[PDB]
Structures are given as C-alpha cells and as structure tokens.
Design a protein around this nucleic acid. Structure first.
Ligand SMILES: [K+]
Lengths: 327, 120, 53
RNA sequence: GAGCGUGCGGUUU
RNA sequence: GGGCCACGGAAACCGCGCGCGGUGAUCAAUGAGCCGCGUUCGCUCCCGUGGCCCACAA
C-alpha cells in the first residue's frame, strides 16, 4: 500500500512569533481565476486512444494556453492519472516525474496456473528488478534497476489476473508482466493498464476527465460560472504535497524569489527529517509555493542554528512582485 | 438509473418499442448504432429514437435526448442494449436505434409517440 | 475493456457487482474524447440539467 | 548538445 | 563575478497508432473494411543571448 511519498511528516516550529501580512501574496484559494490557471495543475484522467502528447496539445488549444507539460507519459491504450502542469506552473512536473506511481493491471496468462502459485510468485517480484527499456521508448535502451514497492493481487478469474502495483518512476509494466509469465513458466501478457497514482496525484475528487474539463471551461468562458472550472484546476502547491517543506518569514520571501539562497534566520517552520541534499519545497506562511531547493542542512541543524545557508534555491515559481523587497 | 434517462417507461410500452424495431427492420428502414442514430436525428429523418437504459459510460448516448428535443423527434427507452441489438437484427448490442421508415409498424410508432408525449 | 470499479467502494474488480460494497460496478476507463467534440453543445445541455446550473 | 518520464519509428535538408 | 527568470539550441514531409467527416459490417454498432482529411508534451543538466537582483530576513 505504501509509496515513499506517503511518509508521515512532523512540522517543527523555529519562530513562533512570525506572522504573515494578508496584503502580501496570493494564497491558493484567493487567486483570481486567471492567476489560478497561470499557476495551476490538472489531475487528468487520460482516456484510452490518443498519446499523452496529443491530449496536452488538445488541452492547450481548447483552454487557450501558451504552455502545458505532462508528467510521466502514459501509452495510447492506457488510461488514468496524468498530471498536466499549466503555464507558469509547468516546471513543477520535475517534483512529479521522479515520484512513485501506482497501476492497476490486468495480466493474461498463456496457461493454467493455480491461484496459490500466482500469488506466491508475484510476491517474489517486490523489491529491485533489472530491466531494459523496450523498443517503443522515449529513453536510452540500456539496462537499469528499478523498485517495485508492492504488488497486490485483487482477483483471479482463470487466466486473468487483476493486480495493483506500486513502482519507482521509469519502471516498465509490460516487461514486469512478461517476467512474471516466465517465472510461472506458462508465459503472460498485459491486456489492460490504468495509472491510479502519480506522487500526490490520486483517484479522488480532483481527478477530472477531458469531457468535464472542457465542459467546465465553457461553463466559465461562455456561461460566466467560475466554480466548476476552478475545481478542475489545482494550485501548483498540490504538485508539492509529497515533498518536505520549510516555511519562511515574509521578510525572506522576495529575496528568495530574486534568487537569494535561504538562510536559517528566514525560517519560521520546517518538516522533521530533512537530510542534506534532499529536494525541498520553500513555502510562505500562507502555504504558497515560493521555490524548490536543495537542503544544505538537516532539520535539526536548521532548528538549532542562527546563521548559515539552509537551502540552496534552484527553481523559483513565485513572481518577484508578490512580496515587497524587505531587505 | 442513469441521468440521461429522463422519464419512466412501463414494461408494456418498452416491449412495444422492441417490437416496433423488429417490424420496421424488414418492412421499412432503421438505423442501428449511436453514430447512425445521431446522424439520422441531425438529418431529421428519424421518426422514433430508441435508447438503451444500460449504456456505460453514459456519454455514449447522453447527448441524444437534448438533440432529439432540439429537432422535435420523439425518443423512448428500453432496459437492455443486447436485447435492442437483437431487435435491430445484429448479433451485437446496440446503445441506440432510429426508425427512418416505419413500414408495417406506422400506427404502433404513432401510438408510442403519443404516450411518451405525456411522459415528457 | 474488462477492468471495472465500484462507484461507492472505489474497488477495482472484473465483476458486475462489487465484492466489497455490493454496488453495481462501472467500466474503469473514462469515455473517449475528440478534439472536434461534435456533440459537446448537446452533452453540455444534459450536464447543465444535471448540475442544477 | 547530454539525459529523464511506460510511445514513438522514418526520410530529406 | 554569482544566483534567479526568460528566450534559443532545427524545420519540412512520411509511417504506425488514434480521431473527425462519409459509408455502415456473415458475433468490434461503445463501429468492421474502404475513401478523404486531421493528428504528438514537457522537464533536468549544459551552452548561447537578454533581463532582474546580490537579499543571513532586519
Ligand atoms: K512506468
């Protein structure tokens, strides 16, 4: 059931007295709709048929967007969770692409095998696997190792095996089913695949179909009803829910957006358990995504110290004029 | 039952619908399948449209009732798409069916049309 | 497409009735979409009626 | 340019 | 100098697949075969050019 991105995180307080000025910045649900889109992500339920790239080309043209990027590419026949980051939020996909995924798969066995055996053998595939990317591949076809975090068999009906699988980014599911078939001797192929999760993007109420997406867009554009399309688009902050965070004081925000590295005296709060080199999200006290960065200290060091660079600022999402240049 | 099903249809009326398609097939002209049925309505050649109650996903046929009301063409439902397929003379299910020429079933069609009028 | 899921439970299954909740299951994959979207207008009229809008 | 992400593979320049 | 942001680091045709329009099938009507037309996302490094800042939070 568990991906690495599921870990419990304790929020620790550095400066209890830090307050945020309501005149500064735009917390997610306070963004006018147009700004909301500018900094938005769609939790798309990809239909079977088109490629992932086509689906985004349609989204851009129908929603009148200059740019949008999707996370891990789903195959033409595969449905399910496809995060689509829009416009100024496009670069957050980088927090997603490397995160863990979950699939529901239907495997067809080429020969009869007792149900007990199937479960036995599939259980043995949890852990590391070695694979080479297939011919139909966007990536170098060289040997590599990847984690299967879990396999759960849901149902067996004769030669059909329905299962959930949690995997590291870049794990090829056809290949995995082929090797399960060989371990069983009888052989197997994949007949159906659906992505049920990518990092923080799951099958919940935020998951939206193309139909609902374009329909809600038209309810907004042509009927003047903002509500539905508003819920169709998630704040870019969602794409960062699985990441360790550090929350910063109002007086550090503009500096960080100008490419200042984050020093310890700018920190108001942080998650427990941050290690050096870890990817972190830098947040305002209003829970706005400021920037992505790399930890230079551990959680306890940031907490214990009064000076020094806490986080190397590498990707800045928040515009420079949302907070005043307080330095 | 599905949100595209606008009104309740009694079993007797539903059976009359499946019989009307049976007759209109060999003695008149029907169109079978959602694309063919939809074209018929846009072309204004449909006399009656028959929609299966068990279409999943809904979106396959969901657009028909509003498009029918737009073109002023009567529509009615039947419980089963497999059964509606059989009636259409195909060995596969059919989500919707149009009657273009009623044939030996003109009066049955006109009867169906006037009781769904009260249900509308 | 053989994969189904219960609209209530959320459970993935091959069966017509959920082995967990007991509800009638639906096909797991979303409907196919055309960029041309010929009946969007009429589908939207149905959806507007559904949504109380 | 070198890589990544379940999808792309050609032919000119 | 450095950090950050932006822009650029190929175009035009072709195929498979998928769609639309047309026609509509000896168990694919939730669309066979055929015709015509459509149809492919970004990110990370790095390098180049330009912009904003140099900010231990005061
Ligand atoms: K994968």
């Amino acid at each position: 059931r568990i991906l690495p991105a599921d870990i419990k995180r304790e929020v620790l307080i550095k400066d209890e007295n830090a307050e945020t000025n309501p005149d500064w910045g735009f917390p997610p649900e306070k963004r006018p709709i147009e700004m909301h889109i500018q900094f938005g992500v769609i939790n798309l339920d990809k239909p079977p048929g088109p490629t992932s790239h086509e689906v985004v080309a349609w989204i851009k043209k129908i929603l009148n967007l200059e740019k949008a990027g999707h996370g891990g590419t789903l195959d033409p026949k595969v449905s399910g969770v496809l995060p689509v980051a829009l416009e100024k939020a496009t670069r957050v996909v980088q927090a997603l692409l490397p995160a863990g995924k979950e699939y529901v798969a239907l495997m067809h066995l080429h020969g009869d095998v007792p149900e007990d055996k199937i479960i036995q053998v599939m259980k043995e595939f949890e852990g590391e696997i070695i694979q080479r990317p297939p011919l139909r591949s966007a990536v170098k076809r060289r040997l590599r190792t990847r984690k299967v975090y879990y396999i759960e068999v849901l149902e067996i009906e004769g030669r059909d095996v329905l299962f959930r699988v949690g995997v590291e980014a870049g794990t090829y599911i056809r290949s995995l089913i082929h090797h399960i078939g060989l371990a069983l001797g009888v052989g197997a192929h994949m007949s159906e695949l659906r992505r049920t999760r990518s990092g923080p993007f799951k099958e919940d109420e935020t998951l939206i179909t193309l139909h609902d997406l374009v329909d809600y867009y038209y309810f907004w554009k042509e009927d003047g009803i903002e509500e539905y399309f508003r819920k169709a688009i998630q704040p870019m902050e969602k794409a960062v829910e699985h990441l360790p965070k550090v929350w910063i004081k109002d007086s550090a925000v503009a500096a960080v957006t100008h490419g200042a590295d984050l020093a310890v005296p700018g920190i108001a709060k942080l998650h427990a358990g941050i290690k050096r080199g870890d990817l972190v999200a830098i947040m305002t006290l209003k829970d706005e995504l400021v920037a992505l960065g790399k930890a230079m200290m551990t959680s306890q060091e940031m907490l214990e110290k009064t000076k020094g660079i806490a986080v190397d600022v590498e990707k800045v999402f928040m515009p420079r004029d949302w907070y005043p240049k307080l330095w | 039952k599905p949100s595209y099903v606008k009104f309740e249809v009694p079993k007797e009326l539903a059976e009359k619908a499946l019989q009307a398609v049976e007759i209109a097939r060999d003695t008149g002209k029907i169109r079978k399948g959602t694309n063919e049925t939809t074209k018929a309505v846009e072309r204004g050649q449909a006399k009656l449209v028959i929609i299966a109650e068990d279409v999943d996903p809904e979106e396959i046929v969901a657009h028909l009732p509003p498009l029918c009301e737009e073109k002023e063409i009567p529509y009615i439902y039947v419980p089963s798409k497999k059964e509606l397929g059989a009636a259409a003379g195909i060995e596969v299910a059919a989500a919707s069916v149009a009657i273009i020429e009623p044939g030996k079933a003109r009066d049955l069609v006109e009867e169906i049309a006037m009781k769904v009028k009260e249900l509308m | 497409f053989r994969i189904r899921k219960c609209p209530k439970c959320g459970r993935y299954t091959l069966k017509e009735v959920c082995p967990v909740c007991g509800e009638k299951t639906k096909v797991a994959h979303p409907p196919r979409f055309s960029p041309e979207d010929p009946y969007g207008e009429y589908r939207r009229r149905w959806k507007r009626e559904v949504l109380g809008i």
